[PDB]
Amino acid sequence: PTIFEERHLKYISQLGKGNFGSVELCRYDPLGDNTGALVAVKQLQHSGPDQQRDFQREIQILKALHSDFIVKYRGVSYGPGRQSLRLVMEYLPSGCLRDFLQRHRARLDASRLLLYSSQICKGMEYLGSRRCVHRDLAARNILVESEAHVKIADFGLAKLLPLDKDYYVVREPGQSPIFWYAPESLSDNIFSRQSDVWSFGVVLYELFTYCDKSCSPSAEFLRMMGCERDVPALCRLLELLEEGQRLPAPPACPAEVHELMKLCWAPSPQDRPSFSALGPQLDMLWSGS
Numbered sequence: 001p002t003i004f005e006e007r008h009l010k011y012i013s014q015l016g017k018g019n020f021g022s023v024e025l026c027r028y029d030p031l032g033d034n035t036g037a038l039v040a041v042k043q044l045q046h047s048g049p050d051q052q053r054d055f056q057r058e059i060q061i062l063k064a065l066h067s068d069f070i071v072k073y074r075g076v077s078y079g080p081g082r083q084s085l086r087l088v089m090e091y092l093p094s095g096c097l098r099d100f101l102q103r104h105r106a107r108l109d110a111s112r113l114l115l116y117s118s119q120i121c122k123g124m125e126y127l128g129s130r131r132c133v134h135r136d137l138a139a140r141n142i143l144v145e146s147e148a149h150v151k152i153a154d155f156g157l158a159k160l161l162p163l164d165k166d167y168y169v170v171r172e173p174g175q176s177p178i179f180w181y182a183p184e185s186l187s188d189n190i191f192s193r194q195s196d197v198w199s200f201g202v203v204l205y206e207l208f209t210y211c212d213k214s215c216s217p218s219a220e221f222l223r224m225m226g227c228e229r230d231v232p233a234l235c236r237l238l239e240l241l242e243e244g245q246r247l248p249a250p251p252a253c254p255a256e257v258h259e260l261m262k263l264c265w266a267p268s269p270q271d272r273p274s275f276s277a278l279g280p281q282l283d284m285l286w287s288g289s
């Protein structure tokens with residue numbers, strides 16, 4: 001089905017929350033005999049008309065995307081009175097990549113991490129071909145379909161580029177993931193496929209740190225930033241990035257991967273590699289392990 005009856009979506013548990021949305025595990029059980037399939041259902045919480053209109057666009061974006069590396073749209077569910085719109089997606093029980101890395105570091109090696117990186121990259125290349133900027137590319141928004149298959153799986157901040165420009169200025173309520181954001185996103189609120197490339201470099205750092213919280217992007221940058229009176233956190237972050245400071249090479253991270261990170265973190269967006277150019281290099285590295 002593409003329209004799911006709200007009364008047949010049986011709530012099981014929370015799967016996650018981010019920005020202004022929440023995703024819940026539900027069994028779509030039309031017969032009520034508890035035989036239906038599990039689905040992931042996203043909805044808004046503490047949201048006004050602005051966020052509701054944004055959520056409708058999020059649905060239309062995900063509905064239009066068709067990639068082995070992008071979570072599958074299944075349909076929508078309209079609450080009573082068509083007042084609480086819900087987005088129904090395939091449920092990937094292995095969960096998000098961040099949690100997966102923190103649980104299974106011992107049995108994951110560089111080749112497997114490079115495979116994930118390659119698949120994320122191909123997903124992002126596809127998004128770019130649809131003129132879609134993700135704006136929230138991070139390990140917490142990647143799902144594990146299987147041991148050797150990941151998917152980009154949250155689009156709460158995603159935007160479609162205008163037809164006349166390859167960038168988009170976005171100023172919206174909520175806390176930004178500033179430690180994944182390129183300098184032009186931090187300062188000018190500009191987002192593009194090349195600002196996503198910056199975030200992808202941070203994702204590479206996350207994967208080869210196994211999303212260890214002690215050396216996460218926030219922990220690392222916050223140590224570099226320090227704390228100065230009348231110097232807001234955003235300014236200190238912009239300052240250290242302009243000075244050339246970057247997240248460090250994760251221990252045991254292959255030198256080639258660290259080089260790619262640094263290229264993704266070029267100061268100016270036009271100087272960063274495209275996802276189309278990163279892909280073949282990641283495939284080569286995964287073939288060399």
Ligand SMILES: C[C@H]1CN(C(=O)CC#N)[C@]12CCN(c1ncnc3[nH]ccc13)C2
Nearest residue numbers: 016017018021022023040090091092153
């Ligand atoms: C991808 C991350 C981001 N997030 C949020 O909930 C963020 C918000 N709001 C999840 C946590 C785990 N999630 C899922 N887990 C299993 N299958 C799934 N299918 C569709 C989604 C989904 C979603």
